Amino acid sequence: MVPISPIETVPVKLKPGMDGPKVKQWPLTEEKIKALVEICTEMEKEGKISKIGPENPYNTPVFAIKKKDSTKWRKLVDFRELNKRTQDFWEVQLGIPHPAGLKKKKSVTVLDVGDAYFSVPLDEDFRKYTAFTIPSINNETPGIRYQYNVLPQGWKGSPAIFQSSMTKILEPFAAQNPDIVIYQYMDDLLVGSDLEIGQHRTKIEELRQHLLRWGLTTPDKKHQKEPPFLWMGYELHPDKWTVQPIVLPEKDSWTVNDIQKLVGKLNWASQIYPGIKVRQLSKLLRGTKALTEVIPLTEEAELELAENREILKEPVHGVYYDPSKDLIAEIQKQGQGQWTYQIYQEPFKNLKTGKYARMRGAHTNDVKQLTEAVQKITTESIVIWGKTPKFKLPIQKETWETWWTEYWQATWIPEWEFVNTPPLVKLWYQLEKEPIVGAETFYVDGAANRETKLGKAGYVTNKGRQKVVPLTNTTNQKTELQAIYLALQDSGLEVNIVTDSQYALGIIQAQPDKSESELVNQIIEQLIKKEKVYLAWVPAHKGIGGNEQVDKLVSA
Amino acid sequence: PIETVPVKLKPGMDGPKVKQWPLTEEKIKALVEICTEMEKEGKISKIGPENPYNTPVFAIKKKDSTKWRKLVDFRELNKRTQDFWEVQLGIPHPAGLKKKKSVTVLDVGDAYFSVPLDEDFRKYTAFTIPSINNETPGIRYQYNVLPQGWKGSPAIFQSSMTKILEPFKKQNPDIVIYQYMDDLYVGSDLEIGQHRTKIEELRQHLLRWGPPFLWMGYELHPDKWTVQPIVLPEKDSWTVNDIQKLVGKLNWASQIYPGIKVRQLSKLLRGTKALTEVIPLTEEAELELAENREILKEPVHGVYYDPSKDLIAEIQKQGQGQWTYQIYQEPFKNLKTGKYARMRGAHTNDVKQLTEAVQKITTESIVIWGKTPKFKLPIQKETWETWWTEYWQATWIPEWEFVNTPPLVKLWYQ
Ligand SMILES: Cc1cc(C#N)cc(C)c1Oc1nc(NC2CCN(Cc3ccc(S(N)(=O)=O)cc3)CC2)nc2ccsc12
Ligand SMILES: [Mg+2]
Ligand code: NA
């Protein structure tokens, strides 16, 4: 007998106030009962469970299930009720490594820890809550009652406690073997190193030697799966990586659930397949929640999908990470608020790719979206590589300087350089900071009747130019924008505009280059064509000449 | 320090469960070294999966030092921690601190590590040192002693601190000492030469009565803190545009001050004149402008600090490295206004300038009222939350919200 260290128990509690489960055991056919008795007898011989007396008042139902070609009954303890009453745990397995952050490893071994899983004892004070009952034949004797001594499969705390127990056991081995890397996730231990296969096979042996100190038997993973390893949806190859094959289904009838899955594949694929777009396709699922509802594809959605198929023709792969090289991120504008990017160290060898879609909004511009793409890539890169990449952006240094020095908000982009790859992000208009000498001055106003929705918009200028246009089905805010639009339409290349509309100033001072309001868009198009525009605000109803005059002309 | 102080959360509130945000590799390595030493010293301990709570942690470099300092973001735990009246019904905030010619700020947070934390409360201080690329489970710790940045630390330690200061306070009856979170604010009216030594005097106390950053001293001069009243231009020739901006400014100021009138000035703008045309001021308009100018000299009326209400700080980017701000509880009743310029370290980084303005404004709020304001920041949330931890150098963290629509009133403080 070689003394083995005991695996430290994790103390467990039920949620405050709640009690253990008390679920009645279903009736079972005589066949299922016999099957369950044999299973539990073996489990008891192995120490996984133990018979209990009648004092225990808790109970969890147990079932017996059958398989396809394996002529077997399997045991099944339905811990759904007990899980609702078990405390929350720290789940240490939220995110998984991204292949683009990994470094190459000459050799990789895969161990199986499914049986060391059962060496993890369950907190003694908590076992009583795991009681279950095998009904007796014909209900003529008391049901055989058991409770678990180990982490039950399907119990709420088993994954976290097992993971934590393994990490604690492996801690010293990993720390005293800096030349290997150990990835534990699930019942698989994944060990890699840059050691020669022989010297690597010994580290593996020493790892068994170490795991044995807690009596953990761990042989090689049966049927060593040839490369690539199929893991978390990736194809991990020795020198390259990729998602498993992405096959876009061909269909004449596209339904809600089809387009969702189509975006999922396209999104999962956009991490290496460069240039994937998904607006139009994601657009088609605006609000519907009936996954069986069929939706016609806009001709802009067929063009987008056909563009995805072409990108999906030939598989693409990414390279692993080299900490001695630079980390570079390059961004391209795709249109319709869509952005694509590649992260690489050497040209033409992407670590990974990605995309960004603009946020919901009535008004926006390309520089704000580009800034948002940079922040997303920044945070993604800190997760994967622990550092910010150097950016290559399709915006002139001079454009950025003008933008941030004049923008009313604070804004910042990290170290970056211009890359001349059209379309370039630019500023489409810049308002004057001071009134323009020699430029005609337009005093604009609009107003609308809230009851009838009839309105007026127009202007009077210092040269005696005037216009009032009658409008239907409008509102105050629309007439205020229409007035500025009219002044832009009717003026020369340089113009001073005086408005009292705080609503219009709020929009224009946000410097949109595109809007979902056709009227704002028309104003942007006019601003683009001007040489100089000074926009001045005054308070309404204060006797400010011009303003007062035009306010009367439009208030009917 | 033997006996712990019984601490509990507020009724019907669980512990914090706040996600750890991603950290650069150099900050992770820094935290790994720091926490390894804290663990050897018994200040923190590894925790098991039965602890579901979490508070974010990052690393900073205090102003003018090269050593990484662990910074826990206890904001969630603080608002969930029971209100404290640890021995008395409350220590009155010293209204005289803001008047002292010089106030030096000491990082005395390390003193907290000598007091054990109530064993039942420790699980709520859980934090995670994250791994890069999710390649290993985060390193999980909880505090065994009063943590820096936690609301309860100064409260529980207040008894121990008062005694350490007694002799110093007994000897220097005119020096004002105020404690906020991990910081000690020490104001005197004597000159910096003896102030610096008198500050060192207080350090040795803390050093004999007991630090990685205690050697530092953040020097302030609140007596020289300048406010910003509303000013109107003084011109010999007014254009139409000048008068329009003036009437707009006075209309805004009339929400703050009574008796502001713009009738005579608006009277000058009769007609539809070119913006650049010069308009001579009538005698009626000049008098009106003079009466408004006089009104704006006097302070705002009925402005009082309500300790039960939040302080609100708004900030405007004025360009060229200049920033204006106003602190208030009710709109148009400013308790403090100010203006900053030439934020050193970032002539080409807006966000770093804004982060420094937030810290300086919070420092003024602590001195004047003893609490931090809720910020309205002129920045998009995603930009701010990506970068502010890179320039943060204070051991506390205020609350903030984001302004997405450009305020029209930026021009009025310009
Ligand atoms: C060890 C491990 C394996 C797998 C798999 N499946 C996944 C992860 C997340 C693992 O965990 C870590 N993986 C790495 N790097 C990678 C780099 C590339 N490969 C592909 C591979 C290499 C060699 C052969 S080969 N020629 O031996 O057949 C076959 C396949 C695996 C190792 N780095 C770390 C750092 C901390 S954990 C961790
Ligand atoms: Mg009007
Ligand atoms: Na355009």
Author numbering:
A (entry chain A): -1 to 554
B (entry chain B): 4 to 213, 225 to 428
Excerpt from the publication:
HIV-1 reverse transcriptase (RT) (hereinafter referred to as RT) plays an essential role in the viral life cycle by reverse transcribing the single-stranded RNA genome to a double-stranded DNA copy. There are two main types of RT inhibitors: nucleoside RT inhibitors (NRTIs), which act as chain terminators and compete with incoming nucleotides in the polymerase active site, and non-nucleoside RT inhibitors (NNRTIs), which inhibit the activity of RT noncompetitively.
Compound K-5a2 features a thiophene[3,2-d]pyrimidine central ring, and replaces the cyanophenyl right wing of ETR with a more extended piperidine-linked benzenesulfonamide group, while keeping the 4-cyano-2,6-dimethylphenyl structure in the left wing of ETR. Y181C and Y188L mutations introduce steric hindrances between NNRTIs and the pocket, and/or eliminate critical π-π stacking interactions between side chains of the two tyrosine residues and the aromatic rings in NNRTIs. Similarly, in the structure of Y188L RT/K-5a2 complex, the cyano-dimethylphenyl group in K-5a2 is diverted away from Leu188 to avoid steric clashes, leading to declines in the buried areas between the inhibitor and Leu188 and Phe227. However, this mutation-caused damage is alleviated by its enhanced interactions with Lys103, Val106 and Pro236.
